[PDB]
C-alpha cells in the first residue's frame, strides 16, 4: 500500500474469493518482523480459509512488540487488539523513506485515552474528551480533560524505537464453510475409481473417488458423516457429486504351526484384495498369502473367520 492508516483507526481489508500465496511475502523477506501465531509461515499454501483479513496501520518501532496475542499495552489495549486464541500472522517493516517528513510526520495518530479496553479487532475513532478527573469536562480541553486522540512525534531524526513501522496483520478465519481464500497449488483433474489424496478448497483426506448415488441441494458444497469428516463433495470447478470411500485397509495376522513342527505360514489380510496386500487364496475374511484352499469341510485348527479355518495337510 502507498499509505497506511493511523493505529487509532486501522484499515481492515476483507479478503474472500481469491488465491492466496503467503510464501511470496515470506520469500521476499522485506519485513523486519514476520511472526505467525497459531499458524506457520513456512509456505503454508496447503491450508485454505473461509475468509482472511488484513489489518493495516502505522506505529512506533518499540510498539511492534505489542502486536501479538496475550498482550497488554497502549496499543494492545486501546488501539489494536488481537484475541488470545488468534490465528494469523504479524508482518512489519520500517518506513523511514516513506513516512518520514521534515518537521515530523504528525498524520499518524494513536489513542491515548478511553474509558475501557478494546475488544479483539474493535476500532474506536471518537474524539470526545476523556474525563480523567471527577468533575465533568463538558467538552472543554484542559487538565484532567484530554482529547483522547494524540499525534505521534515521528521526527526525521529519531532513533529506531521511534521510527514509524508499517504493520499488517493477516487473520485466518476457518468456519464450517467453503474456503474462498485458497493457495495456488498446482491444479489437477480428479481421478475416479482410484485411491487418491484430495484437497478440496483446503479440506484434505485420502480415499477412492466414486460417482454418488445421492444428490445434494444447491446451497452447499459438501456433506459429512458420523465422525464429522467429509462424506461427499461437489467439485468446486464443475459441480459433480462424488463420494469419498476410505481406501482399502485392514489388520494383518499370521497363521502359524508351532515352530517345532514346520515353518509354513500364511498372512491373512482382513477385508482386502489379494492384489492389494503363487500360493494366493482369496476369501471373505481376508486374503491368505502363502496358502492354498480346499472346498471340503474338516475339523477346525487355526480359525480364519466366517466359518473357515486353516489347517495343515500334504
Amino acid at each position: 500500500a502507498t499509505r497506511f492508516a493511523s493505529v487509532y483507526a486501522w484499515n481492515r481489508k476483507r479478503i474472500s474469493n481469491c488465491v492466496a500465496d503467503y510464501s511470496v511475502l515470506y520469500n521476499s523477506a522485506s519485513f523486519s518482523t514476520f511472526k505467525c501465531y497459531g499458524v506457520s509461515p513456512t509456505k503454508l499454501n496447503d491450508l485454505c480459509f473461509t475468509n482472511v483479513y488484513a489489518d493495516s496501520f502505522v506505529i512506533r518501532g518499540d510498539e511492534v512488540r505489542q502486536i501479538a496475542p496475550g498482550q497488554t499495552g497502549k496499543i494492545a489495549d486501546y488501539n489494536y487488539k488481537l484475541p488470545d486464541d488468534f490465528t494469523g500472522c504479524v508482518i512489519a517493516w520500517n518506513s523511514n523513506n516513506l513516512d518520514s517528513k521534515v518537521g515530523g510526520n504528525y498524520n499518524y495518530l494513536y489513542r491515548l485515552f478511553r474509558k475501557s479496553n478494546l475488544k479483539p479487532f474493535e476500532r474506536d475513532i471518537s474524539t470526545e474528551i476523556y474525563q480523567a478527573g471527577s468533575t465533568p469536562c463538558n467538552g472543554v480541553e484542559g487538565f484532567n480533560c484530554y482529547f483522547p486522540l494524540q499525534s505521534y512525534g515521528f521526527q526525521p531524526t529519531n532513533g529506531v524505537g521511534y521510527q514509524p513501522y508499517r504493520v499488517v496483520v493477516l487473520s485466518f478465519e476457518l468456519l464450517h464453510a467453503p474456503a474462498t481464500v485458497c493457495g495456488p497449488k498446482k491444479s489437477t483433474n480428479l481421478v475416479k475409481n482410484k485411491c487418491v489424496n484430495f484437497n478440496f478448497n483446503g479440506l484434505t483426506g485420502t480415499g477412492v473417488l466414486t460417482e454418488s448415488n445421492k444428490k445434494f441441494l444447491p446451497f452447499q458444497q459438501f456433506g459429512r458423516d458420523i465422525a464429522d469428516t467429509t462424506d461427499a463433495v461437489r467439485d468446486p470447478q464443475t459441480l459433480e457429486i462424488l463420494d469419498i470411500t476410505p481406501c482399502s485397509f485392514g489388520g494383518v495376522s499370521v497363521i502359524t504351526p508351532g515352530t517345532n513342527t514346520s515353518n509354513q505360514v500364511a498372512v491373512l489380510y482382513q477385508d482386502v484384495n489379494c492384489t492389494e496386500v503363487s500360493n494366493v487364496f482369496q476369501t471373505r475374511a481376508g486374503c491368505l498369502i502363502g496358502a492354498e484352499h480346499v472346498n471340503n469341510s474338516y475339523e477346525c485348527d487355526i480359525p480364519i473367520g466366517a466359518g473357515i479355518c486353516a489347517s495343515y495337510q500334504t
Partner: antibody
Amino acid sequence: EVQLVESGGGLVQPGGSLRLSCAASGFDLGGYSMHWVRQAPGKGLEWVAGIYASGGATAYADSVKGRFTISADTSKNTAYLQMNSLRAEDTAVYYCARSYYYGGFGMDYWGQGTLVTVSS
Amino acid sequence: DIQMTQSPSSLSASVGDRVTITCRASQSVSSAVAWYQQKPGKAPKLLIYSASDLYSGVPSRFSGSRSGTDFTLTISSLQPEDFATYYCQQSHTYPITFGQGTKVEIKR
C-alpha cells in the same frame, strides 16, 4: 543540541520576591508546556507550576498558589517563574523543565537548578 | 495529586549486576512518569520520561516497562558511575508529587 539554562537565583529575604528565568535552545516552546520544580535542601522534589506555551493556560501546586506565578515567552524562546511573598520555608533549588500537553506525559529535560537560601 | 511509593528503600548490588527499582502510584497516572538519577553534589539527571522514553545523553543501560499498575525501572548492568539516588515523578494531576527516592550500594 538541546539545552536548558537557568539563571536569576540569589538570596532574597522574607517578604521579598525573586524572578527566575530559563532559556531554551535546540527546540521551540510552542507545542510544549514549561514547568518549574522545587528542591529544598535535605528534601526530595515538589512541583511548583506549569504553563502551556501555545495556550497561556496554567496550573499551580496548591501549596504555592497565590504566590508563585508562571509565564512563557515564545518570541524570546524562554520561560519565567515570578515568586512573590517569599518566606524562609520557600528556600530551594529551583529547576526549569519541559513536557508535552498540560499533563499525562513526563518531563523530558530539566536544567541544573539555582539555589536560594534564607534564615533567621 | 497522586502519591508515589518507591521500593526498596535501598538496594545493594555489585558492578555488572542487573538492578530493578519499582514505583507504584496511589491513582492512575497514565504514562506520565519520569525517572531521575542523583549523585552527591549534583542535580538529578533525567534518565527516562513518559514511562518508557529514554532521555538523550543517557546510557542505553537504562530502560523500563509497565505491568498492570506497577512501574519497573531497570539498569541492565550497573557501572561504578550508577551508584546514585533514584526518584519517580508523576506528571498527571497537579500538584505533581514525587516518591521518596531510593539508594544503590556497591557491596564492598
